[PDB]
């Protein structure tokens, strides 16, 4: 049972899955030819010939990104009926992802899901992978998450979105195509993780002691988080942290499904011997503001409910002991109305090493998923950044001419400001 498919969309979405599925083959002994020389069925629907097919739908509207996957290595692993590919790139235009071109290729992506969701006895949920930086990652996903919520109502759907960084930027319409997509992911999504793109450089600078990291030294770190989140569905321990009895340890209200990921340790190979990587330092590293995956300080805000997801050679004795220092004898203040603390997701399997040579092997790892209210400071640097551009009505004529009503920006900003008011609403208990 317990199968869990993962759709990918955008220039970010395929480039993560080009290196995320590179990792899962190492975590099950699967060859690049898909032929294992136990229980992998949460990520591989195998065939009778001894092959293994990954359960992923790589989509993009532009052909030049998937053709890197479709021609280089891992070209025999996937299925050619599922690498969906358009013709026009839908260049940074949310209306060209949600109305114009994405309307044409929705009926092939949605058809390939029902050719994969009918091979699943137990379906845990969906794992989308996109960026909020314009194009299909925000335009086509908004037409996809709205689509899946009709056909699959009572089903979880995770979201590993990349948020646009505050200072580092690639698009010019990065703030335009991010207010437009949060009207989708506020309702249709579920536990939409929003990692940042600048904050992983500040992990690949000091914590990982490499310099000039590419997008291959940055998508490995985003692949390890989706590994140890789903390390409960395919290994053993003291887990009981499957994706429905874990996500009701996260959300206090149906609008506060925006946790942040955080991985630890990320210590390089030359620094791996000069530190006893044990559970006291491994847990205390997760609460460093110089160790989060989003450019935000959780010392400013207050945590609501973390979810510490361990893996590797730990024992629940000192897990519950090292928590109580962080729980009580610290100044990382929790919100008042939940004193129970947070989950604990101990798993037996240690993490592996992608042979690209990024971080050496360890024995312990965390993916803490804190539902802190420090995400409200990750949107006030977008509410101001979008309204500074919309005040002069710049770039609107590239959306209103493509099939989008001009009043939608006055609706999306009105919605996402009321969310930020709602996200700061549950921050206080006593008068």
């Amino acid at each position: 049972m317990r199968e869990c498919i993962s759709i990918h969309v955008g220039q970010a979405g395929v480039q993560i899955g080009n290196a995320c599925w590179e990792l899962y083959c190492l975590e099950h002994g699967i060859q690049p030819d898909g032929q294992m020389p136990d229980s992998f069925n949460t990520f591989f629907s195998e065939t009778g010939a001894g092959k293994h097919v990954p359960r992923a739908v790589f989509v993009d509207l532009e052909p030049t990104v998937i053709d890197e996957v479709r021609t280089g290595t891992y070209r025999q692993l996937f299925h050619p009926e599922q690498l969906i590919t358009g013709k026009e790139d839908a260049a940074n235009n949310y209306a060209r992802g949600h109305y114009t071109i994405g309307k044409e290729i929705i009926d092939l992506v949605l058809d390939r899901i029902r050719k994969l969701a009918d091979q699943c006895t137990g379906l845990q949920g969906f794992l989308v992978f996109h960026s909020f930086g314009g194009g299909t990652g925000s335009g086509f996903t908004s037409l996809l998450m709205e689509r899946l919520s009709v056909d699959y109502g009572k089903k979880s759907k995770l979201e590993f979105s990349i948020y646009p960084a505050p200072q580092v930027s690639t698009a010019v319409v990065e703030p335009y195509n991010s207010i437009l997509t949060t009207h989708t992911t506020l309702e249709h999504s579920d536990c939409a993780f929003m990692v940042d793109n600048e904050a992983i450089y500040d992990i690949c600078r000091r914590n990982l002691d490499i310099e000039r990291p590419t997008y291959t030294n940055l998508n490995r770190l985003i692949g390890q988080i989706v590994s140890s989140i789903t390390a409960s569905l395919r290994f053993d321990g003291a887990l009981n942290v499957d994706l429905t009895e874990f996500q009701t340890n996260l959300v206090p209200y149906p609008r506060i499904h925006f946790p942040l990921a955080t991985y630890a340790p990320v210590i390089s190979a030359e620094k791996a011997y000069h530190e006893q990587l044990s559970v006291a330092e491994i847990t205390n590293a997760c609460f460093e503001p110089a160790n989060q995956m989003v450019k935000c300080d959780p010392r400013h805000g207050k945590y609501m409910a973390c979810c510490l997801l361990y893996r590797g050679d730990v024992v629940p004795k000192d897990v519950n002991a090292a928590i109580a220092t962080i729980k009580t004898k610290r100044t990382i203040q929790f919100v008042d109305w939940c004193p129970t603390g947070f989950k604990v997701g101990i798993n037996y399997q240690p993490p592996t090493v992608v042979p690209g040579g990024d971080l050496a092997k360890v024995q312990r790892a965390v993916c803490m998923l804190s539902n802190t209210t420090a995400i409200a400071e990750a949107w006030a640097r977008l509410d101001h950044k979008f309204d500074l551009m919309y005040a002069k009505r710049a770039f609107v004529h590239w959306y209103v001419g493509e099939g989008m009503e001009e009043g939608e920006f006055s609706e999306a900003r009105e919605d996402m400001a009321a969310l930020e008011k709602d996200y700061e609403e549950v921050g206080v208990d006593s008068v």
Binding site: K103, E146, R147, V150, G403, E405
Partner: protein, 248 residues
């Protein structure tokens, strides 16, 4: 008042035709006195057969829809309380659209129901046009009547077509902003004729393939007027206005 399920409109038979002049002895004030000037008149006004306007390719969508209504307004809408055709809801499309092939050739006095049919049949050459049927449940004093319109959609803006006894339920020009205020023009049309509204029936968008066999879905959504909120009439019908784009 009770419409018949007769067959063979042109030429007519000798059983259904003879009850057209017995029914008028009850509702029409003369009854048998008009038979000497209608049945007993060899001379009759020769109203011709108007043709459907074959539009040139330099004629866009809203200019065609007025030329569509320029056909149906000159079709002499019927008031006799007796149906002349074999129109049903649960009916296949090519058994219905080929009955609309026997509408340009027959061209009898028609009612409001087949005007929605002929509004579909005279709009298959506009692939940018999306249509959908909407029926009303009008409340008179203890009674329930039906009025069905054909709501259209071109260039995002909305509008509706159809025929009735009066002008205010007829063709609407395709320039309305949303779908909820489009029904409000029909709701304001019911305030003038002393009509109360009970239900609004929303249907699926009719597929743009005239040679196909499927039943026309008239009841995709039901909006109870007196038993639902007024904000839900401007929100659920607005999401249904986008849900017709969601199937597509």
């Amino acid at each position: 008042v009770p419409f018949f399920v007769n067959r063979g409109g042109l030429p007519v038979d000798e059983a259904t035709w003879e009850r057209m002049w017995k029914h008028v002895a009850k509702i029409h004030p003369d009854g048998e006195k008009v038979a000497q000037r209608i049945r007993g008149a060899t001379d009759l006004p020769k109203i011709p057969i108007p043709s459907v306007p074959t539009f040139q390719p330099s004629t866009p969508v809203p200019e065609r829809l007025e030329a569509v209504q320029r056909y149906i307004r000159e079709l002499q809408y019927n008031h006799t309380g007796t149906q002349f055709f074999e129109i049903k809801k649960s009916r296949p499309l090519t058994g219905l659209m080929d009955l609309a092939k026997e509408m340009t050739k027959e061209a009898l006095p028609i009612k409001c129901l087949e005007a929605v049919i002929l509004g579909i049949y005279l709009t298959n050459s506009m692939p940018t046009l999306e249509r959908f049927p909407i029926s009303f449940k009008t409340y008179f004093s203890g009674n329930y009547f039906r009025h069905i319109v054909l709501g259209v959609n071109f260039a995002g803006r909305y509008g509706a077509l159809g025929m009735s006894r009066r002008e205010d339920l007829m063709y609407k020009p395709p320039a309305f902003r949303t779908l909820s205020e489009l029904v409000l023009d029909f709701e304001a049309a019911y305030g003038r004729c002393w009509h109360v509204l009970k239900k609004v029936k929303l249907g699926q968008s009719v597929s743009h393939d005239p040679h196909s066999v499927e039943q026309i879905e008239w009841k995709h959504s039901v909006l109870d007027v007196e038993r639902l909120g007024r904000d839900d009439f401007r929100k659920e019908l607005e999401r249904h206005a986008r849900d017709m784009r969601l199937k597509i």
